[PDB]
Design an enzyme around this catalytic site. Structure first.
Site, mmCIF file in Angstrom:
data_model
loop_
_atom_site.group_PDB
_atom_site.id
_atom_site.type_symbol
_atom_site.label_atom_id
_atom_site.label_comp_id
_atom_site.label_asym_id
_atom_site.label_seq_id
_atom_site.Cartn_x
_atom_site.Cartn_y
_atom_site.Cartn_z
ATOM 1 N N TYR A 52 -0.992 2.906 -4.125
ATOM 2 C CA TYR A 52 -0.808 2.407 -5.140
ATOM 3 C C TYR A 52 -1.937 3.231 -6.465
ATOM 4 O O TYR A 52 -1.162 3.767 -7.451
ATOM 5 C CB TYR A 52 -1.302 0.902 -4.968
ATOM 6 N N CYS A 60 3.976 -2.086 -1.165
ATOM 7 C CA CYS A 60 4.938 -2.872 -1.025
ATOM 8 C C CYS A 60 5.151 -3.830 -2.298
ATOM 9 O O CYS A 60 7.031 -3.643 -2.876
ATOM 10 C CB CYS A 60 4.382 -4.131 -1.078
ATOM 11 N N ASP A 95 5.660 -10.855 2.558
ATOM 12 C CA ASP A 95 4.822 -11.115 3.711
ATOM 13 C C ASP A 95 3.890 -12.449 3.268
ATOM 14 O O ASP A 95 3.065 -12.849 2.467
ATOM 15 C CB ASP A 95 3.569 -10.786 4.560
ATOM 16 N N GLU A 121 -9.282 -5.717 -5.280
ATOM 17 C CA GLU A 121 -7.748 -4.908 -4.997
ATOM 18 C C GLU A 121 -7.596 -4.312 -6.316
ATOM 19 O O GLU A 121 -7.313 -2.941 -6.679
ATOM 20 C CB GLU A 121 -7.011 -5.451 -4.413
ATOM 21 N N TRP A 176 -7.673 -3.956 3.490
ATOM 22 C CA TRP A 176 -7.108 -2.935 4.056
ATOM 23 C C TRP A 176 -7.818 -2.435 4.882
ATOM 24 O O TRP A 176 -7.794 -0.836 5.086
ATOM 25 C CB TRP A 176 -7.117 -2.101 2.194
ATOM 26 N N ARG A 232 9.301 -4.919 -2.626
ATOM 27 C CA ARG A 232 10.457 -5.059 -1.492
ATOM 28 C C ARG A 232 10.419 -5.408 0.515
ATOM 29 O O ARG A 232 11.227 -5.959 1.055
ATOM 30 C CB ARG A 232 10.549 -2.977 -1.147
#
Ligand SMILES: C#CCN(Cc1ccc2[nH]c(N)nc(=O)c2c1)c1ccc(C(=O)N[C@@H](CCC(=O)O)C(=O)O)cc1
Ligand SMILES: C#CCN(Cc1ccc2[nH]c(N)nc(=O)c2c1)c1ccc(C(=O)N[C@@H](CCC(=O)O)C(=O)O)cc1
Ligand SMILES: *c1cc(=O)[nH]c(=O)n1[C@H]1C[C@H](O)[C@@H](COP(=O)(O)O)O1
Ligand SMILES: *c1cc(=O)[nH]c(=O)n1[C@H]1C[C@H](O)[C@@H](COP(=O)(O)O)O1
Lengths: 305, 305
Positions: A115, A175, A207, A67, A89, A204
Site C-alpha cells: 500500500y 485488497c 472480509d 494504519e 498486520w 477486490r
C-alpha cells in the site's frame, strides 16, 4: 427498524444476504468462506463531519487511524504499527508467514512494496523497508492533492496500490486496490461555497467481518484528511466490492451483530488547524477527534492468515 | 415500455438522468459535459450466448472486435486499426494530438504503452510501438486464463492497464482501468456443469454517447473469449463508472436515441472450435459470429479529442 435509512444497514443486510444465498467456497487461507461477487456498492454520506464508523460492534478506531497514517507515510514496516499497539498486520508480517510465501530473506514485519509504498513511490525499485525512497517513484497521493486544488474537473484523480510487477514481493496483494476522487464545483447560486469531495474505492476481496469495517472508516478518514488539505468539503464515500465474503468461523459471531440496531454515526473534528497540520504528511493520531461514538460491545472474530 | 426489464434501459435511463440532474462541467477537451459521479453499476447477463450490443443505435461491431483483438495482441500502434478500416484511435494517435501532449518524438499512431501493452507486458520498458516485448513484463491476461483454469477461487484474477509510472508516455490514460473475473463453482446438484464466469470492470471516465457502448460490448466479448479458452460459461458482466458524463454536443443526438425501444440483444457464436482457436491469442475477427442483431439507425456523434 427504528431508523430503516441508517447507512449501516447496508453492511448488515449484505452480511445477511451472503450468509443466506452466498456460495460456499474454498480459499487461500484454508478456513473457507461463503461469498457473492460484485454486490451493489455501499454509499456513505460524509457531510456534516460524519464518520461512518460502524456501531453494531466496537471498532478499533485507533488501529484504523494508525494504519492510515502509516499508509500515507509510505512505510511498509509492520513493526511501526505493533510498536504503537496495533497488531492488525502482525499476522502477515510474521517470520513464519513471510517464509511461507517465499519471502524468508526478509526480517519480520517487512511486508514488501505494499500500500503505502505504491501510494507514494509507485514504480520505484524496492530493496527492503529501510530503503531510501524519498523522491523516487510516482507520488500518487501528492498528485491527487495538487490536482484537486488546481484542476478539480480532471478525470484521472486516482490513487492505486495495484502493481502487477511488485505483487510477488508483497506479503499480501492489495485488497483495496485503488480509489478515485471527484470534486463537485460550487453551485452557481453561491460560488463562495467549498467544492464537494467524493471518493469511490474498489476492493477486490472483502472480509466483511474483519476487514470491511476498517476499510470503510479508513477511506472515509482519508477523504476527510484530503478535504482539509485541499480546502474542499467531504461529501460521499462509495465502496464497490469484488469478491465479498464471510469467513466460515465468522458466521455465528456476525449473527449476534445482526441483532443489533445501529446508533447514529459519530462526527470527526480536527485537534489542529489546516495551517498547523500543513500538508497530507503532517497528520498525527491525536489530531483525529471523534465525538459521539456509541457502539455496542466488541465481537470476537479470528483473522485467517 | 413493452419490455421494462430490458437491460438496455439501464444505459438509456442513466443518460436521461445525467441530462436531467447532471452537473455542467468544464473538461480537458474543452467541449464541456454534464456529469454524475459513481452512479449505480450496470449489470448485463451473458448467459445463453447473449451479447449486450446496444440496439437503440447501430454500433460499429467490427470496430469493437478489432480494438479488442488489438488489446489482446499487446499492440499499441493505431495504424493496425486504421489499416483495417477502424479509425476510433486516429484522433488521439494523430501527430497534432501527440505533439500537443508532449509526445512529438513519436510517429503518428504510436499511442505509447496503453491498454494492450500493460495487459501483456506490464512493467516492461517501452521504447516505441515496434519494440520487441515478447517475454517481457507481466502477462496479466495469460495469468488470468491460467488462474481461472487451475485455481478458480483465487481472489486476485485481475486485468489492469493502470500504470502511474507509464501514464505520461500514454497519448491518453486508460479509461477502463481494470477488471476482475470471478468463477462460480459447479453446484452440488450437477458437478458436471461448467463453472460460471463473471467480470466486473471499473471505468474512471465514461463518454456515454460514444465510449460506453463500445466498452460494454468489448468486455462482454472478452469474457466470452476467456470463457471459451477456460472451459467456463459466461455468466454476468458488471460495469462500475466513475466520472459518468454526456458531452454537450451529444445531448441532442442522444435525445433522439432515448425515444427508441430496445430490441432483444443478439447472440454470439464461434466460427471455429476451442481447439482450432487454441488460446487467447488465436482469435480472428471472422471467428465472431453475431446473430440476431437488429438495431435502429445510426446516430452521429462527434468525438472530442
Ligand atoms: C482491512 C484492514 C486492515 N487489516 C489488515 C488485513 C490483513 C490480513 C487480512 N486477512 C483476512 N483474512 N481478513 C482481513 O480483513 C485482513 C485484513 C486488519 C487486520 C486485522 C483486523 C483484526 O483482526 N481486527 C480485530 C482485532 C482488532 C484489534 O487488534 O483490536 C477486530 O475485532 O476488528 C482488522 C483489520
Ligand atoms: C471506448 C472505446 C473505443 N474508442 C476509443 C476512445 C478514445 C478517445 C475518446 N475520447 C472521447 N471524448 N470519447 C471517447 O469515448 C473516446 C474513446 C472509441 C473512439 C471513437 C468512437 C467513435 O467515434 N464512434 C463513432 C463512429 C464509429 C465508427 O468508427 O464507425 C460512433 O458513432 O460510434 C467510439 C469508440
Ligand atoms: C485484505 C486487506 C484489507 O484491507 N481488507 C480486507 O478485507 N482484506 C481481506 C480479503 C481477504 O479475506 C483476505 C486477503 O486474502 P486474499 O488476498 O484475497 O486471498 O483479507
Ligand atoms: C476513454 C476511452 C474509453 O475506452 N472509454 C471512454 O469512454 N473514454 C472517454 C472518457 C472521456 O470522455 C475521454 C477520456 O478523456 P479523459 O482522460 O477522461 O480526460 O474518453
Amino acid at each position: 427498524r427504528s431508523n430503516p435509512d441508517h447507512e449501516e444497514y447496508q453492511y448488515l443486510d449484505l452480511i445477511r444476504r451472503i450468509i443466506n444465498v452466498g456460495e460456499v467456497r474454498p480459499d487461500r487461507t484454508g478456513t473457507g468462506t461463503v461469498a457473492l461477487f460484485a454486490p451493489p456498492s455501499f454509499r456513505f454520506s460524509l457531510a456534516d463531519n460524519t464518520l461512518p464508523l460502524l456501531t453494531t460492534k466496537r471498532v478499533f478506531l485507533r488501529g484504523v487511524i494508525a494504519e492510515l497514517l502509516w499508509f500515507v507515510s509510505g512505510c511498509t514496516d509492520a513493526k511501526m504499527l505493533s510498536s504503537q499497539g496495533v497488531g492488525i498486520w502482525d499476522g502477515n508480517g510474521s517470520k513464519e508467514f513471510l517464509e511461507k510465501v517465499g519471502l524468508g530473506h526478509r526480517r519480520e514485519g517487512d511486508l514488501g512494496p505494499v500500500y503505502g509504498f505504491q501510494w507514494r513511490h509507485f514504480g520505484a525499485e524496492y530493496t527492503d523497508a529501510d530503503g531510501d525512497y524519498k523522491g523516487k517513484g510516482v507520488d500518487q497521493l501528492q498528485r491527487v492533492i495538487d490536482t484537486i486544488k488546481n484542476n478539480p474537473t480532471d478525470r484521472r484523480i486516482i490513487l492505486s496500490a495495484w502493481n502487477p510487477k511488485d505483487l510477488p514481493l508483497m506479503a499480501l496483494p492489495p485488497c483495496h486496490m485503488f480509489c478515485q476522487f471527484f470534486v463537485s464545483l460550487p453551485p452557481a447560486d453561491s460560488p463562495g461555497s467549498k467544492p464537494k469531495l467524493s471518493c469511490l474505492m474498489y476492493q477486490r476481496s472483502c472480509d466483511l467481518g474483519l476487514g470491511v469495517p476498517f476499510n470503510i472508516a479508513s477511506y472515509a478518514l482519508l477523504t476527510h484528511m484530503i478535504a482539509l488539505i485541499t480546502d474542499t468539503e467531504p461529501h460521499e464515500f462509495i465502496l464497490q466490492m469484488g469478491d465479498a465474503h464471510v469467513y466460515r468461523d465468522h458466521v455465528e459471531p456476525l449473527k449476534t451483530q445482526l441483532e443489533r440496531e445501529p446508533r447514529d454515526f459519530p462526527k470527526l473534528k480536527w485537534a489542529r488547524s489546516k495551517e498547523e497540520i500543513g500538508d497530507i504528511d503532517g497528520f498525527k493520531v491525536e489530531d483525529f477527534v471523534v465525538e459521539g461514538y456509541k457502539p455496542w460491545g466488541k465481537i470476537d472474530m479470528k483473522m485467517s492468515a
